[PDB]
mmCIF file of C-alpha atoms and ligand atoms in Angstrom:
data_model
loop_
_atom_site.group_PDB
_atom_site.id
_atom_site.type_symbol
_atom_site.label_atom_id
_atom_site.label_comp_id
_atom_site.label_asym_id
_atom_site.label_seq_id
_atom_site.Cartn_x
_atom_site.Cartn_y
_atom_site.Cartn_z
ATOM 1 C CA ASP A 2 -41.923 -3.541 26.144
ATOM 2 C CA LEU A 3 -42.541 -7.066 24.932
ATOM 3 C CA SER A 4 -42.484 -7.697 21.110
ATOM 4 C CA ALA A 5 -41.965 -10.731 19.226
ATOM 5 C CA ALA A 6 -38.515 -9.903 18.623
ATOM 6 C CA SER A 7 -37.780 -8.713 22.188
ATOM 7 C CA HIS A 8 -39.476 -10.391 25.259
ATOM 8 C CA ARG A 9 -36.993 -11.240 27.911
ATOM 9 C CA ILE A 10 -37.584 -10.354 31.770
ATOM 10 C CA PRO A 11 -35.051 -10.093 34.487
ATOM 11 C CA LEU A 12 -34.059 -12.665 36.861
ATOM 12 C CA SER A 13 -32.781 -11.498 40.460
ATOM 13 C CA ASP A 14 -29.168 -13.180 39.644
ATOM 14 C CA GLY A 15 -28.740 -10.795 36.670
ATOM 15 C CA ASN A 16 -29.689 -13.116 33.860
ATOM 16 C CA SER A 17 -32.986 -13.034 32.006
ATOM 17 C CA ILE A 18 -35.735 -15.273 30.721
ATOM 18 C CA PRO A 19 -37.906 -15.264 27.488
ATOM 19 C CA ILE A 20 -41.420 -14.751 28.713
ATOM 20 C CA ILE A 21 -42.715 -17.500 26.588
ATOM 21 C CA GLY A 22 -41.354 -21.049 25.863
ATOM 22 C CA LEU A 23 -42.327 -24.377 24.383
ATOM 23 C CA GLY A 24 -42.979 -27.070 26.621
ATOM 24 C CA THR A 25 -41.985 -30.489 25.752
ATOM 25 C CA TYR A 26 -43.815 -33.056 27.941
ATOM 26 C CA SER A 27 -46.063 -35.806 25.946
ATOM 27 C CA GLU A 28 -47.334 -39.131 26.883
ATOM 28 C CA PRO A 29 -44.572 -41.802 25.759
ATOM 29 C CA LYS A 30 -46.691 -44.528 24.586
ATOM 30 C CA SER A 31 -48.234 -42.371 22.233
ATOM 31 C CA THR A 32 -45.701 -39.881 20.747
ATOM 32 C CA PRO A 33 -43.869 -40.889 17.933
ATOM 33 C CA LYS A 34 -40.176 -40.488 18.135
ATOM 34 C CA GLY A 35 -38.831 -37.354 16.604
ATOM 35 C CA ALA A 36 -42.046 -35.320 17.051
ATOM 36 C CA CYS A 37 -40.239 -33.416 19.756
ATOM 37 C CA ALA A 38 -37.414 -32.681 17.942
ATOM 38 C CA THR A 39 -39.360 -31.401 14.922
ATOM 39 C CA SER A 40 -41.589 -29.310 17.216
ATOM 40 C CA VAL A 41 -38.703 -27.502 18.842
ATOM 41 C CA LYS A 42 -37.007 -26.707 15.592
ATOM 42 C CA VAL A 43 -40.509 -25.388 14.417
ATOM 43 C CA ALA A 44 -40.860 -23.161 17.746
ATOM 44 C CA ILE A 45 -37.339 -21.689 17.086
ATOM 45 C CA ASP A 46 -38.250 -20.924 13.262
ATOM 46 C CA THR A 47 -41.431 -19.434 14.480
ATOM 47 C CA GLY A 48 -39.581 -17.104 17.400
ATOM 48 C CA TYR A 49 -39.306 -18.968 20.470
ATOM 49 C CA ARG A 50 -36.311 -18.820 22.257
ATOM 50 C CA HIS A 51 -36.939 -20.610 25.503
ATOM 51 C CA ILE A 52 -37.403 -24.590 25.674
ATOM 52 C CA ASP A 53 -38.783 -26.360 28.813
ATOM 53 C CA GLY A 54 -37.683 -29.917 29.404
ATOM 54 C CA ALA A 55 -37.045 -32.516 31.858
ATOM 55 C CA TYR A 56 -34.924 -35.927 31.540
ATOM 56 C CA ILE A 57 -37.865 -37.659 32.860
ATOM 57 C CA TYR A 58 -39.930 -36.685 29.948
ATOM 58 C CA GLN A 59 -37.795 -39.124 28.146
ATOM 59 C CA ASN A 60 -37.195 -36.968 25.033
ATOM 60 C CA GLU A 61 -34.685 -34.515 26.381
ATOM 61 C CA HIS A 62 -32.213 -35.776 23.586
ATOM 62 C CA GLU A 63 -34.598 -34.683 21.129
ATOM 63 C CA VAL A 64 -34.575 -30.992 22.609
ATOM 64 C CA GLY A 65 -30.749 -31.220 22.236
ATOM 65 C CA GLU A 66 -30.916 -32.360 18.579
ATOM 66 C CA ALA A 67 -33.041 -29.544 17.718
ATOM 67 C CA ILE A 68 -31.206 -26.872 19.635
ATOM 68 C CA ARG A 69 -27.737 -28.139 18.251
ATOM 69 C CA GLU A 70 -29.109 -28.155 14.419
ATOM 70 C CA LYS A 71 -30.505 -24.782 14.687
ATOM 71 C CA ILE A 72 -27.217 -23.556 15.924
ATOM 72 C CA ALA A 73 -25.365 -25.322 13.023
ATOM 73 C CA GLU A 74 -27.552 -23.870 10.703
ATOM 74 C CA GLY A 75 -26.656 -20.518 11.923
ATOM 75 C CA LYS A 76 -30.464 -19.595 12.673
ATOM 76 C CA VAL A 77 -29.275 -18.904 16.493
ATOM 77 C CA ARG A 78 -26.207 -18.909 18.796
ATOM 78 C CA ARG A 79 -26.138 -20.919 22.031
ATOM 79 C CA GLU A 80 -26.423 -17.532 24.224
ATOM 80 C CA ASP A 81 -29.928 -16.684 22.048
ATOM 81 C CA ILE A 82 -31.333 -20.035 23.691
ATOM 82 C CA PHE A 83 -32.664 -20.505 26.948
ATOM 83 C CA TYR A 84 -33.051 -24.231 28.301
ATOM 84 C CA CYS A 85 -34.729 -25.306 31.597
ATOM 85 C CA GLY A 86 -34.071 -28.672 32.918
ATOM 86 C CA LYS A 87 -35.370 -30.533 36.052
ATOM 87 C CA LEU A 88 -33.828 -32.539 38.960
ATOM 88 C CA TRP A 89 -36.305 -35.390 39.528
ATOM 89 C CA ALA A 90 -37.616 -36.449 43.069
ATOM 90 C CA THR A 91 -35.205 -39.523 43.208
ATOM 91 C CA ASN A 92 -32.238 -37.302 42.963
ATOM 92 C CA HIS A 93 -32.433 -35.149 45.973
ATOM 93 C CA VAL A 94 -29.363 -36.809 47.606
ATOM 94 C CA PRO A 95 -26.729 -34.248 47.649
ATOM 95 C CA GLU A 96 -24.110 -36.142 46.099
ATOM 96 C CA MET A 97 -26.441 -37.142 43.443
ATOM 97 C CA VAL A 98 -27.188 -33.661 42.419
ATOM 98 C CA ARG A 99 -24.249 -32.969 40.200
ATOM 99 C CA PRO A 100 -23.912 -36.398 38.680
ATOM 100 C CA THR A 101 -27.797 -36.131 37.459
ATOM 101 C CA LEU A 102 -27.051 -32.797 35.959
ATOM 102 C CA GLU A 103 -23.915 -33.902 33.911
ATOM 103 C CA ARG A 104 -26.210 -37.005 32.659
ATOM 104 C CA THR A 105 -28.425 -34.247 31.050
ATOM 105 C CA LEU A 106 -25.631 -32.568 29.764
ATOM 106 C CA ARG A 107 -24.533 -35.832 28.046
ATOM 107 C CA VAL A 108 -27.939 -36.185 26.882
ATOM 108 C CA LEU A 109 -28.190 -32.552 25.301
ATOM 109 C CA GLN A 110 -24.668 -32.488 24.344
ATOM 110 C CA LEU A 111 -24.391 -29.022 25.462
ATOM 111 C CA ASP A 112 -21.813 -27.235 28.076
ATOM 112 C CA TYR A 113 -24.533 -25.703 30.465
ATOM 113 C CA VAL A 114 -28.413 -25.353 30.908
ATOM 114 C CA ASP A 115 -29.754 -21.861 31.574
ATOM 115 C CA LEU A 116 -32.088 -23.008 34.337
ATOM 116 C CA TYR A 117 -32.038 -26.077 36.407
ATOM 117 C CA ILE A 118 -34.652 -26.548 39.121
ATOM 118 C CA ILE A 119 -36.020 -29.047 41.665
ATOM 119 C CA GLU A 120 -38.571 -30.855 39.967
ATOM 120 C CA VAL A 121 -40.786 -31.272 43.285
ATOM 121 C CA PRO A 122 -40.067 -30.543 47.080
ATOM 122 C CA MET A 123 -40.660 -34.242 47.731
ATOM 123 C CA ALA A 124 -37.839 -36.622 47.857
ATOM 124 C CA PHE A 125 -38.283 -40.309 46.639
ATOM 125 C CA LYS A 126 -36.063 -43.075 47.065
ATOM 126 C CA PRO A 127 -32.603 -43.139 45.157
ATOM 127 C CA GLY A 128 -32.217 -44.884 41.821
ATOM 128 C CA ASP A 129 -32.729 -45.231 38.162
ATOM 129 C CA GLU A 130 -36.360 -46.053 38.800
ATOM 130 C CA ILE A 131 -38.472 -42.839 38.213
ATOM 131 C CA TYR A 132 -41.515 -44.163 40.155
ATOM 132 C CA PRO A 133 -40.209 -46.405 42.795
ATOM 133 C CA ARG A 134 -43.061 -48.535 44.397
ATOM 134 C CA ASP A 135 -42.597 -51.836 46.467
ATOM 135 C CA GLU A 136 -44.159 -55.243 46.266
ATOM 136 C CA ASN A 137 -47.534 -53.915 47.518
ATOM 137 C CA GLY A 138 -47.570 -50.912 45.157
ATOM 138 C CA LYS A 139 -46.665 -48.455 48.114
ATOM 139 C CA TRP A 140 -44.453 -45.554 47.211
ATOM 140 C CA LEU A 141 -40.929 -45.514 48.159
ATOM 141 C CA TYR A 142 -40.123 -42.330 49.748
ATOM 142 C CA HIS A 143 -37.064 -40.711 51.083
ATOM 143 C CA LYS A 144 -36.504 -38.070 54.001
ATOM 144 C CA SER A 145 -36.134 -34.777 52.191
ATOM 145 C CA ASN A 146 -33.674 -32.156 52.918
ATOM 146 C CA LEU A 147 -34.231 -29.045 50.809
ATOM 147 C CA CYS A 148 -31.444 -27.082 52.346
ATOM 148 C CA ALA A 149 -28.719 -29.857 51.617
ATOM 149 C CA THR A 150 -30.026 -30.522 47.989
ATOM 150 C CA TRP A 151 -30.031 -26.790 47.324
ATOM 151 C CA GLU A 152 -26.352 -26.546 48.597
ATOM 152 C CA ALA A 153 -25.374 -29.118 45.951
ATOM 153 C CA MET A 154 -27.384 -27.080 43.192
ATOM 154 C CA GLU A 155 -25.446 -23.954 44.153
ATOM 155 C CA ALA A 156 -22.114 -25.682 43.599
ATOM 156 C CA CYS A 157 -23.361 -26.755 40.219
ATOM 157 C CA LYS A 158 -23.705 -22.945 39.460
ATOM 158 C CA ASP A 159 -20.189 -22.382 40.738
ATOM 159 C CA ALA A 160 -18.820 -24.807 38.659
ATOM 160 C CA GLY A 161 -20.608 -23.332 35.543
ATOM 161 C CA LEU A 162 -22.936 -26.214 34.649
ATOM 162 C CA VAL A 163 -25.953 -23.910 35.093
ATOM 163 C CA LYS A 164 -26.627 -20.070 34.640
ATOM 164 C CA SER A 165 -29.512 -19.751 37.029
ATOM 165 C CA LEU A 166 -31.054 -22.146 39.935
ATOM 166 C CA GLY A 167 -34.816 -22.350 40.705
ATOM 167 C CA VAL A 168 -37.571 -24.492 42.064
ATOM 168 C CA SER A 169 -40.950 -26.223 40.959
ATOM 169 C CA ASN A 170 -44.146 -26.918 42.972
ATOM 170 C CA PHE A 171 -42.930 -25.421 45.924
ATOM 171 C CA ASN A 172 -45.296 -23.580 48.507
ATOM 172 C CA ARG A 173 -44.719 -20.704 50.701
ATOM 173 C CA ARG A 174 -43.080 -22.570 53.658
ATOM 174 C CA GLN A 175 -40.788 -24.652 51.139
ATOM 175 C CA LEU A 176 -39.481 -21.516 49.602
ATOM 176 C CA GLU A 177 -39.067 -19.672 53.005
ATOM 177 C CA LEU A 178 -36.780 -22.662 54.287
ATOM 178 C CA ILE A 179 -34.401 -21.886 51.416
ATOM 179 C CA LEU A 180 -34.690 -18.002 51.452
ATOM 180 C CA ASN A 181 -33.888 -18.080 55.257
ATOM 181 C CA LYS A 182 -31.151 -20.735 54.949
ATOM 182 C CA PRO A 183 -27.938 -19.678 56.716
ATOM 183 C CA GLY A 184 -25.190 -19.113 54.422
ATOM 184 C CA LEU A 185 -27.440 -18.886 51.457
ATOM 185 C CA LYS A 186 -25.326 -18.431 48.191
ATOM 186 C CA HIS A 187 -27.721 -18.177 45.325
ATOM 187 C CA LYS A 188 -31.531 -17.226 45.770
ATOM 188 C CA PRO A 189 -33.786 -19.286 43.781
ATOM 189 C CA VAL A 190 -34.758 -17.035 40.616
ATOM 190 C CA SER A 191 -37.950 -19.018 39.768
ATOM 191 C CA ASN A 192 -40.901 -21.103 40.759
ATOM 192 C CA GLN A 193 -42.648 -23.290 38.364
ATOM 193 C CA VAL A 194 -46.046 -23.906 39.217
ATOM 194 C CA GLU A 195 -49.513 -24.560 37.582
ATOM 195 C CA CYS A 196 -51.103 -21.244 36.382
ATOM 196 C CA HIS A 197 -54.011 -20.240 34.279
ATOM 197 C CA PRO A 198 -57.313 -18.457 34.545
ATOM 198 C CA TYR A 199 -58.907 -21.242 36.513
ATOM 199 C CA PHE A 200 -55.997 -21.239 39.055
ATOM 200 C CA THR A 201 -54.505 -17.867 39.120
ATOM 201 C CA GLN A 202 -52.236 -18.436 42.156
ATOM 202 C CA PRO A 203 -52.868 -14.887 43.834
ATOM 203 C CA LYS A 204 -51.046 -15.311 47.010
ATOM 204 C CA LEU A 205 -48.176 -17.224 45.802
ATOM 205 C CA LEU A 206 -47.529 -14.720 43.152
ATOM 206 C CA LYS A 207 -47.737 -11.971 45.560
ATOM 207 C CA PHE A 208 -45.241 -13.788 47.609
ATOM 208 C CA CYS A 209 -42.716 -14.513 44.830
ATOM 209 C CA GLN A 210 -42.925 -10.932 43.919
ATOM 210 C CA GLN A 211 -42.096 -9.845 47.339
ATOM 211 C CA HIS A 212 -38.630 -11.756 47.046
ATOM 212 C CA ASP A 213 -38.045 -11.168 43.178
ATOM 213 C CA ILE A 214 -39.060 -14.585 42.394
ATOM 214 C CA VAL A 215 -40.227 -14.952 38.694
ATOM 215 C CA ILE A 216 -42.893 -17.515 38.385
ATOM 216 C CA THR A 217 -43.306 -19.851 35.366
ATOM 217 C CA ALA A 218 -46.637 -21.087 34.758
ATOM 218 C CA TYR A 219 -46.666 -24.825 33.772
ATOM 219 C CA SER A 220 -49.971 -26.082 32.286
ATOM 220 C CA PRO A 221 -50.731 -22.619 30.823
ATOM 221 C CA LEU A 222 -53.559 -23.922 28.587
ATOM 222 C CA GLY A 223 -54.966 -26.160 30.999
ATOM 223 C CA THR A 224 -53.132 -29.384 30.646
ATOM 224 C CA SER A 225 -54.002 -32.093 27.913
ATOM 225 C CA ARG A 226 -56.811 -33.176 30.065
ATOM 226 C CA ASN A 227 -55.476 -36.927 30.044
ATOM 227 C CA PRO A 228 -58.090 -38.502 32.444
ATOM 228 C CA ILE A 229 -54.903 -40.861 33.353
ATOM 229 C CA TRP A 230 -54.051 -38.274 35.523
ATOM 230 C CA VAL A 231 -55.927 -35.001 34.780
ATOM 231 C CA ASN A 232 -58.419 -33.748 37.392
ATOM 232 C CA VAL A 233 -61.347 -33.878 34.718
ATOM 233 C CA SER A 234 -63.940 -32.679 37.211
ATOM 234 C CA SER A 235 -62.889 -29.242 36.228
ATOM 235 C CA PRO A 236 -64.279 -28.066 32.729
ATOM 236 C CA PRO A 237 -62.054 -27.619 29.781
ATOM 237 C CA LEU A 238 -60.286 -24.268 29.941
ATOM 238 C CA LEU A 239 -60.196 -23.265 26.371
ATOM 239 C CA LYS A 240 -64.101 -23.857 26.031
ATOM 240 C CA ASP A 241 -64.629 -21.247 28.594
ATOM 241 C CA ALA A 242 -67.584 -18.785 27.595
ATOM 242 C CA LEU A 243 -65.801 -15.431 28.378
ATOM 243 C CA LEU A 244 -62.310 -16.596 27.109
ATOM 244 C CA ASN A 245 -63.946 -17.408 23.922
ATOM 245 C CA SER A 246 -65.950 -14.469 23.930
ATOM 246 C CA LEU A 247 -62.717 -12.184 24.715
ATOM 247 C CA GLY A 248 -61.106 -13.997 22.009
ATOM 248 C CA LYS A 249 -63.484 -12.626 19.249
ATOM 249 C CA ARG A 250 -62.783 -8.969 20.391
ATOM 250 C CA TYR A 251 -59.409 -9.237 18.953
ATOM 251 C CA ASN A 252 -59.799 -12.107 16.687
ATOM 252 C CA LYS A 253 -57.718 -14.457 18.760
ATOM 253 C CA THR A 254 -58.364 -17.729 20.238
ATOM 254 C CA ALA A 255 -59.128 -18.656 23.952
ATOM 255 C CA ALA A 256 -55.463 -20.199 24.087
ATOM 256 C CA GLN A 257 -54.087 -16.735 22.772
ATOM 257 C CA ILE A 258 -56.153 -14.919 25.501
ATOM 258 C CA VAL A 259 -54.988 -17.049 28.593
ATOM 259 C CA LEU A 260 -51.354 -16.617 27.154
ATOM 260 C CA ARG A 261 -51.495 -13.084 27.030
ATOM 261 C CA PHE A 262 -53.139 -12.884 30.483
ATOM 262 C CA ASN A 263 -50.400 -14.394 32.420
ATOM 263 C CA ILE A 264 -47.273 -12.646 30.229
ATOM 264 C CA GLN A 265 -48.947 -9.373 30.794
ATOM 265 C CA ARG A 266 -49.104 -10.022 34.301
ATOM 266 C CA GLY A 267 -44.996 -10.723 34.205
ATOM 267 C CA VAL A 268 -45.697 -14.438 34.588
ATOM 268 C CA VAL A 269 -43.731 -16.803 32.294
ATOM 269 C CA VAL A 270 -45.784 -19.055 30.189
ATOM 270 C CA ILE A 271 -44.649 -22.462 28.547
ATOM 271 C CA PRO A 272 -47.554 -23.882 26.585
ATOM 272 C CA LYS A 273 -46.860 -27.268 25.058
ATOM 273 C CA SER A 274 -47.740 -28.163 21.398
ATOM 274 C CA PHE A 275 -46.235 -30.704 18.873
ATOM 275 C CA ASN A 276 -48.642 -29.185 16.248
ATOM 276 C CA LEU A 277 -47.387 -27.137 13.386
ATOM 277 C CA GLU A 278 -50.263 -24.757 13.407
ATOM 278 C CA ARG A 279 -50.800 -24.464 17.348
ATOM 279 C CA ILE A 280 -47.157 -23.825 18.001
ATOM 280 C CA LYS A 281 -47.366 -20.720 15.615
ATOM 281 C CA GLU A 282 -50.776 -19.778 17.165
ATOM 282 C CA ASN A 283 -49.464 -19.621 20.627
ATOM 283 C CA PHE A 284 -46.672 -17.494 19.771
ATOM 284 C CA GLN A 285 -49.003 -14.486 18.223
ATOM 285 C CA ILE A 286 -49.466 -12.982 21.165
ATOM 286 C CA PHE A 287 -47.490 -9.602 21.011
ATOM 287 C CA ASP A 288 -49.798 -7.768 18.352
ATOM 288 C CA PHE A 289 -52.483 -7.177 20.880
ATOM 289 C CA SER A 290 -53.004 -6.653 24.800
ATOM 290 C CA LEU A 291 -55.789 -6.851 27.324
ATOM 291 C CA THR A 292 -57.516 -3.990 28.788
ATOM 292 C CA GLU A 293 -57.122 -3.230 32.439
ATOM 293 C CA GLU A 294 -60.927 -4.298 32.564
ATOM 294 C CA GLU A 295 -60.226 -7.348 30.555
ATOM 295 C CA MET A 296 -57.513 -8.405 33.097
ATOM 296 C CA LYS A 297 -59.882 -8.280 36.025
ATOM 297 C CA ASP A 298 -62.531 -10.249 34.109
ATOM 298 C CA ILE A 299 -59.944 -13.014 33.432
ATOM 299 C CA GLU A 300 -58.823 -12.880 36.806
ATOM 300 C CA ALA A 301 -62.456 -13.411 38.373
ATOM 301 C CA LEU A 302 -62.607 -16.797 36.649
ATOM 302 C CA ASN A 303 -60.124 -18.177 39.440
ATOM 303 C CA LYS A 304 -61.988 -21.504 40.697
ATOM 304 C CA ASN A 305 -59.030 -22.414 42.932
ATOM 305 C CA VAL A 306 -58.948 -25.990 41.425
ATOM 306 C CA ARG A 307 -55.872 -27.475 40.293
ATOM 307 C CA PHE A 308 -55.812 -29.906 37.150
ATOM 308 C CA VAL A 309 -52.577 -31.088 38.663
ATOM 309 C CA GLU A 310 -53.229 -32.503 41.955
ATOM 310 C CA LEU A 311 -50.624 -35.346 42.495
ATOM 311 C CA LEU A 312 -53.178 -37.091 44.890
ATOM 312 C CA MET A 313 -50.837 -40.293 44.685
ATOM 313 C CA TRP A 314 -48.310 -38.463 46.834
ATOM 314 C CA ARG A 315 -50.626 -36.577 49.209
ATOM 315 C CA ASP A 316 -48.948 -38.612 51.697
ATOM 316 C CA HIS A 317 -45.762 -37.643 51.451
ATOM 317 C CA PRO A 318 -44.400 -35.360 54.316
ATOM 318 C CA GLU A 319 -43.204 -32.453 51.881
ATOM 319 C CA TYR A 320 -46.668 -32.859 49.832
ATOM 320 C CA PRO A 321 -47.039 -29.125 48.803
ATOM 321 C CA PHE A 322 -50.718 -28.620 48.176
ATOM 322 C CA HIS A 323 -52.210 -29.241 51.719
ATOM 323 C CA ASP A 324 -51.236 -25.574 52.569
ATOM 324 C CA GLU A 325 -53.539 -22.523 51.458
ATOM 325 C CA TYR A 326 -50.292 -21.590 49.517
HETATM 326 N N1 NDP B 1 -42.656 -28.911 36.815
HETATM 327 C C1 NDP B 1 -43.839 -29.527 36.704
HETATM 328 O O1 NDP B 1 -44.377 -30.396 37.651
HETATM 329 C C2 NDP B 1 -44.664 -29.599 35.351
HETATM 330 C C3 NDP B 1 -44.183 -29.088 34.196
HETATM 331 N N2 NDP B 1 -44.960 -29.066 33.200
HETATM 332 C C4 NDP B 1 -44.128 -28.369 31.903
HETATM 333 O O2 NDP B 1 -45.299 -27.211 31.544
HETATM 334 C C5 NDP B 1 -45.466 -27.536 30.344
HETATM 335 C C6 NDP B 1 -47.102 -26.902 30.165
HETATM 336 O O3 NDP B 1 -47.764 -27.842 28.987
HETATM 337 P P1 NDP B 1 -48.700 -29.027 29.481
HETATM 338 O O4 NDP B 1 -48.861 -29.171 30.986
HETATM 339 O O5 NDP B 1 -48.183 -30.361 28.673
HETATM 340 O O6 NDP B 1 -50.050 -28.601 29.050
HETATM 341 P P2 NDP B 1 -50.704 -27.319 28.305
HETATM 342 O O7 NDP B 1 -51.670 -26.452 29.079
HETATM 343 O O8 NDP B 1 -49.399 -26.533 28.013
HETATM 344 O O9 NDP B 1 -51.082 -27.934 26.844
HETATM 345 C C7 NDP B 1 -52.190 -28.960 26.828
HETATM 346 C C8 NDP B 1 -52.628 -29.504 25.583
HETATM 347 O O10 NDP B 1 -52.920 -28.209 24.894
HETATM 348 C C9 NDP B 1 -52.762 -28.595 23.572
HETATM 349 N N3 NDP B 1 -52.622 -27.070 22.805
HETATM 350 C C10 NDP B 1 -51.671 -26.504 22.596
HETATM 351 N N4 NDP B 1 -51.837 -25.225 21.983
HETATM 352 C C11 NDP B 1 -53.231 -25.437 21.484
HETATM 353 C C12 NDP B 1 -54.033 -24.534 20.951
HETATM 354 N N5 NDP B 1 -53.474 -23.212 20.696
HETATM 355 N N6 NDP B 1 -55.304 -24.593 20.782
HETATM 356 C C13 NDP B 1 -55.814 -26.010 21.354
HETATM 357 N N7 NDP B 1 -55.102 -26.905 22.083
HETATM 358 C C14 NDP B 1 -53.860 -26.300 22.163
HETATM 359 C C15 NDP B 1 -51.885 -29.555 23.200
HETATM 360 O O11 NDP B 1 -52.284 -30.408 21.947
HETATM 361 P P3 NDP B 1 -51.101 -30.560 20.832
HETATM 362 O O12 NDP B 1 -49.795 -31.158 21.149
HETATM 363 O O13 NDP B 1 -52.084 -31.319 19.848
HETATM 364 O O14 NDP B 1 -51.281 -29.071 20.099
HETATM 365 C C16 NDP B 1 -51.611 -30.361 24.658
HETATM 366 O O15 NDP B 1 -52.026 -31.582 24.531
HETATM 367 C C17 NDP B 1 -45.214 -29.014 29.869
HETATM 368 O O16 NDP B 1 -45.175 -29.591 28.667
HETATM 369 C C18 NDP B 1 -44.186 -29.115 30.847
HETATM 370 O O17 NDP B 1 -42.679 -28.878 29.925
HETATM 371 C C19 NDP B 1 -46.065 -29.607 33.101
HETATM 372 C C20 NDP B 1 -46.703 -30.172 33.991
HETATM 373 C C21 NDP B 1 -45.978 -30.427 35.280
#
């Protein structure tokens, strides 16, 4: 039940997802071209069979290059690889959903994506511009209609362009809007949100479990802590005293402890690293386990403080972080 060779958990639609994957976000201005492609190939050699990306990260093509090359080499087959892509805020308009996915398919040079999700529940003004703002720097929004957007997504699955459908950054109310939708064809199988020892998501996780929705934890190591956008007010997760002390009990790092914590609770983790050594390190989480006591010690570290607040959009009608969960 969870080994390096076998670690996929069931999704409610019949498919499965590798409990750990490689995250690929990285600040453009300072990330050398090819770093992503090289990192993805290293991840595959190491044992990863899940990659998390997004067209807006500006390196989706590099993910395709690495996946296609590893298939060409015969290291893996397409069906062995699980790739997750995301529909951005500026693409919520129903008629723009399929064209957006197809563009990503051209970028990857693949026939389908294993998981496609609505990146944020907030709709932004349609266009090529990813971060639309008017002359006065004010954010250009659009009226959201999550049920209409979801229907367009379902049609994408019916056409064979994506295996499983999901969401990201959705709160309880937003999930329920979809779940109780009349004529619902494909239930969301996953909700990707921030999750780690400082923000354990106890109520949302419990809610998702009740509806057989699997949570994928983004920023599982606590983010890169880039001041430009990260809530630096909260202390660096990997420097946590207890996590480090627990690490010495099994000769593992804090990073390895936090990753084991979530996977052991049935939570998918997608740590990002473009460093040869760290990529390998993050994968060594199947040769040990945390005791029931230790899981409770780690859970008690919950501060209910997000490292990713997205405050610039707190004025959007569908901003997901006002509600308790
Ligand atoms: N849908 C959404 O709204 C969002 C989705 N995401 C997704 O979730 C993924 C989660 O990763 P992310 O948010 O970037 O942050 P993470 O918490 O995964 O990692 C942040 C930093 O950790 C470092 N790191 C990795 N391994 C180790 C280690 N063993 N020891 C010390 N430092 C380490 C990396 O540096 P280095 O590369 O030098 O190793 C990196 O800069 C993303 O890459 C993205 O795919 C992220 C935010 C939002």
